[PDB]
Amino acid sequence: LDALSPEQLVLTLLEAEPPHVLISRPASMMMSLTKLADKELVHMISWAKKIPGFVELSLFDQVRLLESCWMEVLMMGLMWRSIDHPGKLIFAPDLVLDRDEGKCEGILEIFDMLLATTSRFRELKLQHKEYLCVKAMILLNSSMYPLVADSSRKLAHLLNAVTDALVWVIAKSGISSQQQSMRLANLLMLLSHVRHASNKGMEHLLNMVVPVYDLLLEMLNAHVL
Amino acid sequence: LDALSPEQLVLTLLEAEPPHVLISRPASMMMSLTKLADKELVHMISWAKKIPGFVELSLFDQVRLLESCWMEVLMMGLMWRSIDHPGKLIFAPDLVLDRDEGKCEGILEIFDMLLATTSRFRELKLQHKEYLCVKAMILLNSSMYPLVADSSRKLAHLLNAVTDALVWVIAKSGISSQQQSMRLANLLMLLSHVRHASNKGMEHLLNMVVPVYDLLLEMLNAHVL
Numbered sequence A, B: 001l002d003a004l005s006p007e008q009l010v011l012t013l014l015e016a017e018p019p020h021v022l023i024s025r026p027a028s029m030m031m032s033l034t035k036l037a038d039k040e041l042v043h044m045i046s047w048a049k050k051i052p053g054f055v056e057l058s059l060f061d062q063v064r065l066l067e068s069c070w071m072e073v074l075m076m077g078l079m080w081r082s083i084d085h086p087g088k089l090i091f092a093p094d095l096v097l098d099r100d101e102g103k104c105e106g107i108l109e110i111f112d113m114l115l116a117t118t119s120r121f122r123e124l125k126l127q128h129k130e131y132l133c134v135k136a137m138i139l140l141n142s143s144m145y146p147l148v149a150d151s152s153r154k155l156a157h158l159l160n161a162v163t164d165a166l167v168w169v170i171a172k173s174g175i176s177s178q179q180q181s182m183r184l185a186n187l188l189m190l191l192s193h194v195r196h197a198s199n200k201g202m203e204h205l206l207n208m209v210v211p212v213y214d215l216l217l218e219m220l221n222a223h224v225l
């Protein structure tokens, strides 16, 4: 109830944000990168557990959602981290990248998908409160199977609340009702792009390094046991 | 101007809908399927040329948009065609499929992504006017590169108009302002799913039949010359 209310929901999400992850280095890009994800994934699962109502869904649903959405959530965080640095990607404190470093490959393709989309978010002037709500939407909207009898009723309620909070945030800008709808529409259309980049990253990842998708699956098990 | 107005824009789109395509048969599924797309693509390009303002964009933009969005537009049409037939996919008049025919493979995965998403549109009670506006959004939102000096100003104007028409359509249902936003949000979140299915179909398609993506590219050239 209360916890799912716009002002509160948004401040609960703020405290649930994952920490800075240091890669901690003593196929090097891809070595750096896969070790990073392994690290980031642990925190991702913690983050999800702090989203009001998520742990009360079915574990059959929790596991489905985290499995399908991990790369879009790590990419959404990445764009938010690089949003002010045109030309770069800020993967972590000691791991920043130039586009011309994405020349050594296949990675260059993905690199430009993430710079472009990020530039789009810059132009829209993505607010923190907006960022927090969209990343939560990405997790809850990541699959359709899990919302095809109570956990479903629950999943929708919890997804509708987040959409309510975003709408709320936007209404506070003091813009016109038409601007509101145009902004809500521009924001959610951008998720289609996010998913695209995710699909490509996932693709690149099987054509190959650390067992990110393995261990995660493993983390998913312990998460159940 | 006028042509981009909600009631009119929606009736212009109605007359621009492609015809019934008969496959016309005298790797058979995939033979049927690739021949079908070759056929459907010709009409797709005609359809796009009837969307007010599209031919006045740069050809550098026209070609980018059709190239990136062809499979999502053929899948969006497919779901609309099967929306009332649970368990099937209605690819064309003489080409209907059962899920258990999608067992002979890899195609089964995709098959369930398209049944699920379609079921979602059923539950939402997707209206014709709504269908017409979303399919146009899919084409105009298909890439971000082309909207990263006039053709861009133009592209946004033309995408904003379509979003205006959809919003208009939804406001006519006589539902509550909160229902409006929740419905607009539910509709555009579904595009993320559409793109997902597209990405998978595209994937399946290179791992392989008719040169769909070749000839299309070819059609793209003639389209310029």
Ligand SMILES: CCCC[C@@]12CCC(=O)C(Br)=C1c1ccc(O)cc1C2
Pocket: A033, A034, A036, A037, A040, A074, A075, A078, A091, A102, A107, A108, A110, A111, A114, A201, A202, A204, A205, A212
């Ligand atoms: C353009 C290269 C992007 C690498 C990105 C996608 C490709 C990949 O294999 C990995 Br493991 C990647 C990754 C790790 C952590 C993170 O937060 C985001 C990503 C995306």
Ligand SMILES: CCCC[C@@]12CCC(=O)C(Br)=C1c1ccc(O)cc1C2
Pocket: B033, B034, B036, B037, B040, B074, B075, B078, B091, B102, B107, B108, B110, B111, B114, B201, B202, B204, B205, B212
């Ligand atoms: C589940 C199988 C789907 C086949 C679908 C995606 C896989 C594929 O190779 C082809 Br050519 C396909 C196709 C053709 C026409 C059309 O309107 C839609 C599609 C999607």
